[PDB]
Structure formats: C-alpha cells, structure tokens
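Batch queue: ligand-bound targets. Current item pairs a single chain with JMM. No template structures supplied; prediction is de novo from sequence plus SMILES. Inputs echoed for audit trail.
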Amino acid sequence: QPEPDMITIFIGTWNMGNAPPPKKITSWFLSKGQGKTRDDSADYIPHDIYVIGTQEDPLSEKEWLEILKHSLQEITSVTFKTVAIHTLWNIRIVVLAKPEHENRISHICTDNVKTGIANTLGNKGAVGVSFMFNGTSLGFVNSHLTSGSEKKLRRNQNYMNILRFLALGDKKLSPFNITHRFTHLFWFGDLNYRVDLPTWEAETIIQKIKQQQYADLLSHDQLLTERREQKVFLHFEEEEITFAPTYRFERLTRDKYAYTKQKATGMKYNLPSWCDRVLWKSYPLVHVVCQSYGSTSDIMTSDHSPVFATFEAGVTSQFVSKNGPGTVDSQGQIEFLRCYATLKTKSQTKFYLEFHSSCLESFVKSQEGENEEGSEGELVVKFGETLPKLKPIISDPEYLLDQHILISIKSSDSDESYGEGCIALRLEATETQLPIYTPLTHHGELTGHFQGEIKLQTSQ
Ligand SMILES: O=C(c1ccco1)N1CCN(C(=O)C2CC2)CC1
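Prediction returned. Tokens below.
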C-alpha cells in the first residue's frame, strides 16, 4: 500500500453562538452552500483529515465528537479516528483522520493562548494542534479574536500574541514561532474583522449582499486592508471570498442580517461582516491548492454561518536510506555563497546564523558575519563564502529536493533571533550556483531579508 504524496484537508470554522447545532450539519463537511463549493461527484470521497474549529461552543467535547463522527460516518461510511481535541473556554479544535492514517500521524501537540489582560482576559484566545503526517509537519490554529468594528488594532495584537506564545511543533526549533515550524500551517476562526463602512450604510450593504455584489464590501474588509498594509497575517494566503458575509444573522433563518445596536450587543452595531475565515501559510514550493472556500446556507442555529475550506496539500514519506537516519550521507551537501542579511535594526551587535532542518542531524551555527552600513541607512551583515557546508542525513535527490532550511539571524550579544525565514531546496538544478531569498520576520513582523546563492549536491 503506497505512501501518499498528497492528502486533502478539510478546515471548518463555526461560531455556534452558544446554541446547540441542528440535527443535520453534513452540508458543512460537504463544502455546499455559497462561495467556492465542492462538486457533487466528490460527496462520498472522504478527506484525509478534518479540522473543526468552533467558537462560543456550548457542547462538551464528548457531545461534539459524537455529532462530528456520526456526521462524517453518514457522509463517507468511514469511522474517523480522533487525533486530538483541545478546548479553551468555549473555543475548541477537533482533528479527525481516516483510520488508514493512524500509523502515519505522530508527535501530536496541543496548546492554547489566552489573549488580553484583566478586563480583556477570560474569553478570547486560540487553541491549536500540530502533528507529523509521515515526513510533513502540519499545524492548525483556531482563534476567536477581539470583537467590535473599532477594535481592529486589538485583533492584530491578539494575532501577534497567539503566534508568539502558542507552543506547537518541534521545540528544538527554538528561534522559530508557529509561522515557521510547519510545512503547512492553517489559521482559522472567528477572526472578527469587520466591513468598515458607516453605520448609516447598513441597508445599502444588505442590498449589495442580496445582489451578490461583494466587491465594494470586500474593499472595506478590515482583514484584507490590514493584510495589504502588512499589519497582520504577513506571508499568509486566503482564497478569494465569493460568499455572503457570515455574520450577523437572525437565528433560525438566513433571510435577515441583525445589525442594529441592542443592549445585548453593548449598544454596538454589527454591520454584515466576514468574521469567519481560513488562511494558510506553506513552505516555499510545496504544493497547496484551495479546492473550496464558502459558507453553508442551511445551518441556522447561530448568528454566524459555518465556513468551510478544503485543500490539496503535498506530503512526503518517512525516508530511510542505508545511511541516514542515524548518520550523514557524504554524497550530499548544501553550500551558501555570497550570502548577506539586510536588517531593519538600529542595533550594532555582531550577528551569526543558525540553520535548522529535519534533513540535518542537528542545527548548525555559523561564524559571525561582517557588518556594513547600507546606502539607505540599513544594517547589511555579510557572510561571504564563510558559511558552514551543511551535511544532510540523506543524499537521495527524491528526498533532499523536498526539504527546507530554516534560517535565524541571532545577536552574538544576546543570542536572541532578530529574523527568521525559510529556503526551499526544490532547486532548478543541482551542482549549480542559484539565487536564494527569504524575507526575515520576528514575532511575525518584517525585520529584514536574507539572500545569496546556494549550491546543492545530491547523490545524482
Ligand atoms: O491572500 C491572498 C494572497 C494570494 C497570494 C498571497 O496572498 N489574496 C489574493 C487573492 N484574492 C483575491 O481576492 C483576488 C481576486 C482573486 C484573495 C486574497
């Protein structure tokens, strides 16, 4: 039975509005309703992995697991295995996988982050799950961010706290946050970004939604505008939105948006908004294709509609050779030529690099680079031809060209990372000097760039 080179992943996010679900929710897992929907001819084909994020979830873990498993069994005739479940307050993540994957999944991690301080600590935050699927690392984050149209900057802060403090994936990757730890990272939830138009325009917005004319609404969506201005979710991707706003509905119909200020809303307007979102970030040149992104039309117990997204995702096998794992393969090497980091920092410490990758036995520290002043005020750290030759555990090009090198640039004075990035080994050629590039981030904000050339030797 061959190991897969691609899997499909279902991502669901639903703010349940503290109400139990209706008796049938299969439309969610079938990607049917509005937006980019799944073809009817696929209905019986199970996804490999289902990741369900809920917010304002009133159910016990047992109660929800029973509903989810019975839903999937009805659709697929498959009894899914529970990989992980984790709840913070009323924020929950469930991961289910086909039974055939049970011995492909390992290193399962769960964690949560509570956002805010005092007043603002006690119901918002995030849960997450990570695991290895054969040779591929997968991370999943369900976040319920701060509500309210005038709190976009709080949501951006909540994002920054979650990616700093959520402890998922390989703890040996100590310089790297969750935005670098995984081959594929999916981040979803009630992100709570709103359509920023005047309150007086509520009925105009409603009109536009009835005409399925979303363009003048999406141009005011705070998540799209904040992302464009690099304030949040830097280096993530979202599929184009082609479904109606998923909030705020009157319960038990989808015919009415309930936007007016009420005592129950703290006298806040809730103009129709795309609160409920799915974004992802995959390592460079790894296959990932969104095959659905939409909302259900027939699940009406909440003031939010469920959102679904599905993905094709490239995966790799747990590679064994005669040599690695447990030794190097002398037929393999990675060389970095003419490399330099450009950093936005005002500081004047020396810097060194760390190279981290599961193709190495352990991470590799470089010598200090040579600081120069850039023409436009920047710090340029030159490494020249000084960088250590990296010795991969396996030299087979079928393995090595699928790998990635994480890079951290660290202060010699503090050993703190000033920037993290990632280089693919999926090169156009081997034994050939080729340009490489990554942006560098720290706490998920842009701090610089790393560029130079690579020369990869494989056994072929
Ligand atoms: O998140 C991204 C993105 C793509 C690549 C890097 O980031 N986008 C662009 C594509 N989108 C659109 O709405 C375009 C009309 C198709 C949705 C937002």
